[PDB]
């Protein structure tokens, strides 16, 4: 049984935040988002994370061929009143699909232009030589394996799916308001 | 004595006297993510949002139209005010795939100088470290 459900956020809670930084997966880096809504307790009676709270995360490793989503780990959230909790949770899309996804640059030209250009110049030279009366494989072998790059615009909506139980017993307490 | 100094500092921060407010703000775009109020005090710009509204992301727009990040703090009794740490002629508000432009129609290039090192003209920031 859970201890205090008024000072608790359990696993599988969805935190809806808006992406601040523009995300480009060329280099490893850090992301940042702000909560758009208040997050209540599991009992649904106490606001544990206020809206406008700042979440800091990071990504690394880049993408592989055929992948269109990057894994983002959100590391820490700071409440506007100064509460800090280390949630190390996976970042998702607006509907909870794993990883952040945007527009993918597959670098078609950087991967095939050398081979195409080599082949076309070879054929043009052969045509000119005939009109008097493999390098392409080497080029392709070296540049075929270029991982794709993901671009995600700023201001996009994302979710943080809480991977562990968050306990707020040490930083908040409740008191009744004197009536009238 | 230090409690007295801290109380004096908090009182000076709260008193907030001699402040001029600019309310000449226009908006165009997606009005569903719009604030209910926007103003600035000459140092910070404040956007107030309703209780049922999601808090959006706010961006700094330069003369050429490029957007850039600006630091923000969330203030207000119910965290309904976003305070950005700059005064600028144009602002961009984005939430998801909706955008709204905010225009400061009384932009003062001069502003008011920050001679004290704090957000208030009643508190100095003083160099403790010496060295």
């Amino acid at each position: 049984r859970l201890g205090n459900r008024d000072m608790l956020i359990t696993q599988g809670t969805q935190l809806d935040c808006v992406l601040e930084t523009r995300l480009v997966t060329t280099q490893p880096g850090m992301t940042t988002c702000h909560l758009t809504r208040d997050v209540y307790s599991t009992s649904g009676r106490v606001v544990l994370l206020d809206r406008g709270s700042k979440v800091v995360g990071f990504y690394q490793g880049g993408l592989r061929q055929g992948q269109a989503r990057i894994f983002v780990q959100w590391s820490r959230i700071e409440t506007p009143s100064g509460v800090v909790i280390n949630l190390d949770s996976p970042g998702t899309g607006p509907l909870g699909e794993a990883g952040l996804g945007g527009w993918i640059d597959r670098h078609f030209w950087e991967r095939f232009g050398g081979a195409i250009m080599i082949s076309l110049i070879g054929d043009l030279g052969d045509w000119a030589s005939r009109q008097g009366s493999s390098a392409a494989a080497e080029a392709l072998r070296n540049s075929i394996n270029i991982p794709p790059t993901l671009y995600k615009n700023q201001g996009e909506r994302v979710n943080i799916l809480v991977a562990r139980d968050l306990d707020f017993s040490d930083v908040y307490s409740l008191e009744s308001i004197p009536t009238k | 004595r230090e409690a007295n100094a801290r109380a004096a500092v908090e009182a000076a921060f709260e008193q907030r006297v001699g402040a001029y407010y600019n309310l000449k703000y226009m908006m165009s775009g997606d009005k569903d993510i719009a604030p209910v109020n926007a103003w600035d005090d000459g140092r910070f710009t404040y956007f107030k949002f309703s209780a049922n509204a999601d808090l959006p992301s706010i961006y700094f727009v330069d003369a050429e139209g490029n957007e850039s990040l600006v630091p923000r703090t969330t203030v207000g009794s119910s965290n309904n005010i976003i305070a950005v740490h700059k005064v600028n002629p144009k602002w961009m508000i984005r939430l998801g795939n909706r955008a709204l432009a905010i225009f400061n129609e009384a932009y003062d290039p001069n502003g008011v100088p920050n001679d004290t090192g704090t957000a208030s003209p009643a508190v100095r920031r003083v160099n403790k470290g010496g060295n």
């Binding site: 671009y151 615009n153 | 165009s28 775009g29 109020n37 207000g76």
Partner: peptide, 28 residues
């Protein structure tokens, strides 16, 4: 031949005042 799409640019037609009423934080 393909570039990253830009975020939506807001339309500059329906330009209206933000402040319909004076905020109460201004004490007015």
């Amino acid at each position: 031949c393909a570039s990253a799409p830009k975020p939506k640019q807001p339309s500059d037609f329906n330009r209206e005042p933000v402040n319909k009423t004076v905020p109460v934080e201004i004490q007015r």
